[PDB]
Design a protein around this ligand. Structure first.
Ligand SMILES: CC(=O)N[C@H]1[C@H](O[C@@H]2[C@@H](O)[C@H](O)O[C@H](CO)[C@@H]2O)O[C@H](CO)[C@@H](O[C@@H]2O[C@H](CO[C@]3(C(=O)O)C[C@H](O)[C@@H](NC(C)=O)[C@H]([C@H](O)[C@H](O)CO)O3)[C@H](O)[C@H](O)[C@H]2O)[C@@H]1O
Lengths: 467, 473, 486
């Protein structure tokens, strides 16, 4: 009876810490490199889809964002890299990044009219600009009111709002910075104006800045916007002697958990995922992926590898223990029932036969190993892509430094874990053949000649009942 | 030739098998605390009770009874205190101030602008928002209103001769209405002006109607600075200034953190404090609580990290243990590996002392490497960010979770990988004990195959020892 | 006659540690922790660093007279700045977003100073004002790149000036506001009392008012100058308007970049060597996965780590084990065997000898080389800066940076140490296994014909000349003979 190990037509290759390009009978890749090329719903909830609009564009009601979808609940934001329709009237948005991060993910979101336009009797309310032109006519941010002089008079404009919505409300306001003192007087009459905003938490007084600037969309003037979270049951007070750009609406918002923004050109598709990249969604149990660094969801660890191949079967031969590709020179393509087994040449016939108990125990072992590498990986929801202003470069560099930091830790460890485990595995199979061999040799004792090639030549006669 | 077995029900997992029973094991995952808030390296924490740092430094009257030490290693503060800005308002760079105060070598209050030297101004102002016994009071540390119907330019200054750096706080009053302004300060276009060698700051009050907070529409906006040794701070104001009377000498140190908790100091010791209790361990990992202060183990998302130290209990790469030697010997109590021997003078179990000792050193070392290579430094973990700092806080979470994942994955696999190497190690030891005996006896014995050698010749106690010894011939 | 299986021994005294043992003497060892530098500050990928001398970046950009002599190159890869220079803001004051400025300047593909608002064009204004705080040769002077605008005649007409960025590149621009000590100063300098400084671009809208107040004197001044900066995009325009107190730029700096680097705090001076990795003590030239030289490096560096040594066993246990061969049933090594790691003795009636088994020595050698290379070449190295700047109101942020850098410190050290402790034992076991296998290969051939002494040797029952020995080492041998038997 002969002792041998399985061999097949496999051309799969793995490396170990001692050998590269070793051919094995079976292998498991543990690096996910496939997506589905689709922007999907994350955990059952769609993304907010901004088209060519930016967040500021959208919130303020740039007329060019009139046709936006708007869902009441979203799980991330889809925004173009360099949108197109933002502040149609030129200016700036204070703490814009914090806002985007606030809005990035929401359980509920609903726009409500909080200070209706027509309540500003005493003030004119129809001022628009050609920078926000619809059909060549002057127009303005659909969610905001430009308050100007009426008749030739601008009385103290007061307006408050008690947040009885039932949820936290995001409110936005603006300050108009004129281009010249003339523009100032023709608009507001008063010359030493201020704009005042107040809650239980907020106290802000702003004074318009009247100066000549380079024209942007045809204007030396600017509008500076700002925001706040009006708490439940708190009240907001607006008071201005000119230059106020009052909100008509607010946004009850209720969140949730915080997510992120995804820069893409694509459009939602009605598939499902727990892990979205800008190239498509990943759906895996694997520990690592190399698809794209900017994921949103619960994702495998991003790693720099091209491949991470774990050996599972043995060395395919057409070791620490000296058996495989050792004193048993090669494998048996004829043995198909298992990894290790017997040959046995009889005067009743020949044949091959796997040793079911020792192949099953090797299989459970290798199954347990693969499962350990895979299920010990802890995966938690993260956004990754982040937003910093032009004055927060250090902070952005901090974040890159850190992201690169984990990239290198995970890459080194994954490359190496794989290298080291492959050599143990190959040694495991070697040990297993060696042990099956020794288990037979310890029985047959003197009754057989030990040929040296893993074969035992019986002195006596041994038929099927003997085998 | 055989190996140890016992009644151990201890389990470990390894990279190939789960739920393996081992004669011995070592847990290397600390998961216990003492339930106490303790002194940190022999230094107490500041106990704010129901007070905020702001309330405490401003002099909120509800804070009169605070303990105050001249030195502390962290700060204890409740989640959402209660006694903060009794008079509604705000505190610029409050979070930067907390981090600075979080740990102090020395901290002494010093009078820098005596209340009574403000002649020309009324100095008695207060509010029912800061009420003590239904009477209007004010921040105990802070002080300026019109006197007669006049608010002359108010100027105060102080040269830091205190021999240390000094924390100095000051305020601006924002009134609810112009009437409130004129009856407080007479003047209208007023300002407050703080200056040092380093700081230049001018503020103007915001008069305006606001939602009532403790019945006040008005607000108080506080700011601070560190006055250097021998530098001077200069206040100037035509109205609306809330001046400091006191300053705080401050010497640091190394920086720490605030601990959000409801407890109270208890007089024990620790090098690692957690919101649940103190941790006293040499163990490389714990899972007590993420928000720790001190020199702590790595925080890991694990329920158990159990490292086999003994062999597999049997009441492997090397085919001996639970292999060609089917079972253990509870009979053998001296060591891990040994001999039985059957004589015409008796029977016996005896452990092989040399090989047991070697393996023991071996394992001892393995446990010590896993444990003593863990580099532990002082850290606070728990951090403070304002509402307008949500990205920053999110970066911090991303980091703490990143590291939480790296150490977890690493601790789980190390334990799995080393557990199987250990069991394999015991296996190799017995194979080698067995092989060592085989290569001596040679022909003089029948090799039964259960790990036993039957002697052709007769082998008394003397010759038994010659086998267990290395001797024999 | 006997043939013996055995293994190499040498005079090495090199020690490694393994998960199970400590201070194990091996015949060969490879260090993977870099600890040597060259003492020099160098060009970094062929590109010199900007050398600032006793100057700070602020002082260099403003044109502190005391920085007049600075070399200045149109491209650098990192900046050298002393810890606490000396020649910064000669006139007391501040610089907003200073730290961001330094970050952006740290590393520049192109840098060129250009004249954007010629001092002489400020007719209607006085332009010659200076201070003895910026004094050259006892005389008042000023920031060489900046213009102090003051009253002329007794008149300060509104000052308007602009610059369209036709330079071809982004341009750094800096301006200042003078904050007087008192109202009389204000009037003697600018006539006007309610002044503002206004600065605007497509992107920037800023209006300041001078703050008039008594402050402690610095360099004898109660006044302060506060500076601000902006990057003007190509084809954008910057507008300055003021009725007083404006400190106006004469120059701007065209800037093209790049990839961003950092500042190195050092007293040293550039020395004309090369490196891809610069540290404050010296340049590092290495292929090694880890270093312990200095935490604050610039370039592509091995991973900094808190260890004193990381030595990897490459040879075997030096004895002049999992498989029981080495320092096992074969008690010792052979100093006499020089040719390889494992081989044969053999003692004939044609003489004695040692000989390495070349095939098994070469395999092992290939194996160990593959292991070292793995540990070494899987390390991914990219370009980083490390050293960082934070203002005094940014201590939490600095703590975040520190916690991060420390956190990675604890990961690499722990992992580096343990990888070495684990690989050393595997290396020792591997050599052991190799010998065991060489041993068994001979046992299986020789069979019955020899006596197995239990020490690694085989005593033959027959006679075995050199051609016979050869057949044993060759794997040939056989065996019918036999003799004896008889
Ligand atoms: C002490 C005082 O001035 N009280 C009330 C004030 O009386 C003024 C009096 O000083 C003057 O000589 O002649 C008339 C007499 O009535 C003046 O008007 O009259 C106001 C109008 O009713 C009251 O306003 C309100 O006060 C409430 C809270 O009052 C306190 C406070 O506890 O916060 C009382 C403090 O003594 C006072 N402190 C100082 C230094 O004046 C403060 C302070 O004025 C404000 O906090 C500053 O913002 O206010 C509520 O504000 C209520 O809504 C409002 O009607 C004066 O109480």
């Amino acid at each position: 009876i002969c002792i041998g190990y399985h061999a097949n037509n496999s051309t799969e290759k793995v490396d170990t810490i001692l050998e590269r390009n070793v051919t094995v009978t079976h292998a498991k890749d543990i690096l996910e490199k496939t997506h589905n090329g689709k922007l999907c719903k994350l955990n059952g909830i769609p993304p907010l889809e901004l088209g060519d609009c930016s967040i500021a564009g959208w919130l303020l009601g740039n007329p060019e964002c009139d046709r936006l979808l708007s869902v009441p609940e979203w799980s991330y934001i889809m925004e173009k890299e360099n949108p197109r329709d933002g502040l149609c009237y030129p200016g700036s948005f204070n703490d814009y990044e914090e806002l985007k991060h606030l809005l990035s993910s929401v359980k509920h979101f609903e726009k409500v009219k909080i200070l209706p336009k027509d309540r500003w009797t005493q003030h004119t309310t129809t001022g628009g600009s050609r920078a926000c032109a619809v059909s060549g006519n002057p127009s303005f941010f659909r969610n905001m009111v430009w308050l100007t002089e009426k008749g030739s008079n601008y009385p103290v404009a007061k307006g408050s709002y008690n947040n009885t919505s039932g949820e936290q409300m995001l409110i936005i306001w603006g300050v108009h910075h004129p281009n010249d003192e003339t523009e100032q007087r023709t608009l507001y009459q008063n010359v030493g104006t201020y704009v005042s905003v107040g809650t239980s938490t907020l106290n802000k007084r702003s004074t318009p800045d009247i100066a000549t600037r380079p024209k942007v969309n045809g204007l030396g003037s600017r509008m500076e916007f700002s925001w706040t979270l009006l708490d439940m049951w708190d009240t907001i007070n607006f008071e201005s002697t000119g230059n106020l750009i009052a909100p008509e609406y607010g946004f009850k918002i209720s969140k949730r958990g915080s997510s992120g923004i995804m820069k893409t050109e694509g459009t939602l598709e009605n598939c499902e995922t727990k892990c979205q990249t800008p190239l498509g969604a990943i759906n895996t149990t694997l520990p690592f992926h190399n698809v794209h660094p900017l994921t949103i969801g619960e994702c495998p660890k991003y790693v720099k590898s091209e491949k991470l191949v774990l050996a599972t079967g043995l060395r395919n031969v057409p070791g620490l223990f000296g058996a495989i590709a050792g004193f048993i020179e090669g494998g048996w393509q004829g043995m198909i029932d298992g990894w290790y087994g017997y040959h046995h040449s009889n005067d009743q016939g020949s044949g091959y036969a796997a040793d079911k108990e020792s192949t099953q125990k090797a299989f459970d072992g290798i199954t347990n190993k693969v499962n350990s590498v895979i299920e010990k990986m802890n995966t938690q929801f993260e956004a990754v892509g982040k937003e910093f202003s032009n004055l927060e470069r250090r902070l952005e560099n901090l974040n890159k430094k850190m992201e690169d930091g984990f990239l290198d830790v995970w890459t080194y460890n994954a490359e190496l874990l794989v290298l080291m485990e492959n050599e143990r595995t190959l040694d495991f199979h070697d040990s297993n053949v060696k042990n099956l061999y020794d288990k037979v040799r310890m029985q047959l004792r003197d009754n057989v000649k030990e040929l040296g090639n893993g074969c035992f030549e019986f002195y006596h006669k041994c038929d099927d009942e003997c085998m």
